[PDB]
Design goal:
part of a larger assembly; 3 chains; A: 4 helices; 76% helix; elongated; B: alpha+beta; Nucleotidyltransferase, domain 5; 3 domains; 6-stranded mixed β-sheet; 16 helices; 19 strands; flat; structural protein; Dynein
């Protein structure tokens, strides 16, 4: 359970690295803007597809069954 | 920025403190201040004129006890300052107060002066970075991992039912009654005097509390148990003398389900629960009855769950499914919830900043507590 | 027992040296004085650490068993 907890912590930190990305509007070209926004959208969709995979759902289910609600609630909420 | 927030559940009976992330409250200890009543004569005596936490416990006989907060309101603020300072002592949490944020859990419908003075004490005396008053029911639901339910938290000093549905609390449905475990222990002391054992002294009162812990059960039928003969379980005092309880064993906790016994015309615990649910809207009632979460130390009485189920079944509408969920860690549920909530980065948005409090004062904390 | 008592006498005298360091504030810079007090902080914690060492505690227990109560009492309380 502790190993799964630390793994979910790593997952949450990695997801927050991508979800919290923000671009300064003033800097760079609008071409860079469109590239940034589409790349971010593709990354989020890939992350979402990974998140719905049976592995992550199984991990969350194991953590719930062990009453380790820290990681599960954080993953459901902190990721944004 | 800061490294880690500190969760402090300042329950009237026991104060439970630890760091956010820890699965168990690392440092939980009784919520009273003990001062020596006798005279010091021989050098090399116990140091200090104030005793808190375990050190008071090993030397309980020497000390006069003083509870700082009674029914969830801090009557003595200097003592509460001292115990909060003890929470940061080298014994517990061994860290500076100005470095870590703090989450504090207060009882619902408490006086406004209580929360504002509390925020004052944390922000001036301790110079904490950020503070967040919180409701115990929300944390209990977080710890159980539920967004719905009715939290019936019966701590030492106060009992209260809060209905929460899908992360929304109905504030007008929150029922609070001051009858709680400490009142049960007072009633038990009175009955033990009636049986012929006196515990007038302050330190002795903790013995009455331990008696309540060890040998007290809630009968399914109080009257049928009353007419029948008791078992008269004996309890050994710390010195060695025994005391025989008998009929007071079950008549004591029945104070919770009938406050008429002490003489207070207040709602019973089952009445608190059913009134809280019924006071809500119709559509949710069934789901609320399907989800009942028990918290607080007073819920650990033997037979509490079954008696409560019988009472709510009698008072609830017929053919309704009642399911009372009693986790194993009821006593430390609220702190675990506080830890979970603090661990969330969203906590960064709820708490009040020291600069914000200084700029706005009590208005800021009053806004960001409800 | 007399040897260990003399050792305890040495210990209490040495600890009295550290506990009774009183500096003239006029002599030295502010840095010198604050450094002196911080070193005193850490030194008194080190003396607490030494006091709890098993060998010294065994010495005190031996003196107690030999009923040289004067040395044990002086070590416990008179150190300041």
């Amino acid at each position: 359970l502790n190993q799964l907890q630390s793994g979910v912590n790593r997952w949450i930190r990695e997801i927050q690295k991508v979800t919290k990305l923000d671009r300064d509007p003033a800097s760079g070209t609008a071409l860079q803007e469109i590239s940034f926004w589409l790349n971010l959208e593709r990354a989020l969709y890939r992350i979402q597809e990974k998140r719905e995979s049976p592995e992550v759902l199984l991990t969350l289910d194991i953590l719930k069954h062990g009453k380790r609600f820290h990681a599960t609630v954080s993953f459901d909420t902190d990721t944004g | 920025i800061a490294n880690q927030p500190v969760v402090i559940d300042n329950g009237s009976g026991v104060i439970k403190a630890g760091f956010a992330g820890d699965q168990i409250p690392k440092y939980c200890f009784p919520n009273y201040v003990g001062r020596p009543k006798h005279v010091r004569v021989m050098a090399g005596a116990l140091e200090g004129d104030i005793f808190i936490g375990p050190k008071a416990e090993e030397h309980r006989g020497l000390l006069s006890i003083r509870y700082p907060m009674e029914h969830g309101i801090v009557k003595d603020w200097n003592d509460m300052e001292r115990i909060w300072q003890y929470v940061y002592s080298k014994d517990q949490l061994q860290t500076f107060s100005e470095e870590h944020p703090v989450l504090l859990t207060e009882a619902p419908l408490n006086p406004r002066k209580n929360r504002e003075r509390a925020a004052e004490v944390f922000f001036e005396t301790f110079n904490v970075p950020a503070l967040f008053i919180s409701m115990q029911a929300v944390l209990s639901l977080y710890a159980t991992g539920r967004t719905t339910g009715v939290v019936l938290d019966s701590g030492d000093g106060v009992t209260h039912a809060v209905p929460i549905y899908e992360g929304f609390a109905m504030p007008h449905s929150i029922m609070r009654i001051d009858i709680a475990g400490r009142d049960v222990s007072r009633f038990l002391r009175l009955y033990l005097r009636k049986e012929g054992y006196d515990f007038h002294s302050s330190s002795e009162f903790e013995i009455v509390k331990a008696i309540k812990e060890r040998a007290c059960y809630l009968s399914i039928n109080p009257q049928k148990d009353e007419t029948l003969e008791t078992e008269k379980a004996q309890y050994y005092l710390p010195d060695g003398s025994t005391i025989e309880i008998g009929p007071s064993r079950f008549r004591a906790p029945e104070l919770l389900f009938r406050p008429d016994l002490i003489g207070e015309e207040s709602e019973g615990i089952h009445e608190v629960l059913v009134f809280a649910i019924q006071k809500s809207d119709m559509d949710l009632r069934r789901t609320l009855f399907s989800n009942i979460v028990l918290s607080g130390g007073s819920t650990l009485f033997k037979g509490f769950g079954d008696r409560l189920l019988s009472e709510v079944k009698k008072l609830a509408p017929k053919d309704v499914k009642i399911r009372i969920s009693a986790p194993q860690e009821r006593l430390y549920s609220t702190w675990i919830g506080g830890s979970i909530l603090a661990s969330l980065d969203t906590f960064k948005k709820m708490w009040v900043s020291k600069k914000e409090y200084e700029e706005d004062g009590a208005r800021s904390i009053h806004r960001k507590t409800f």
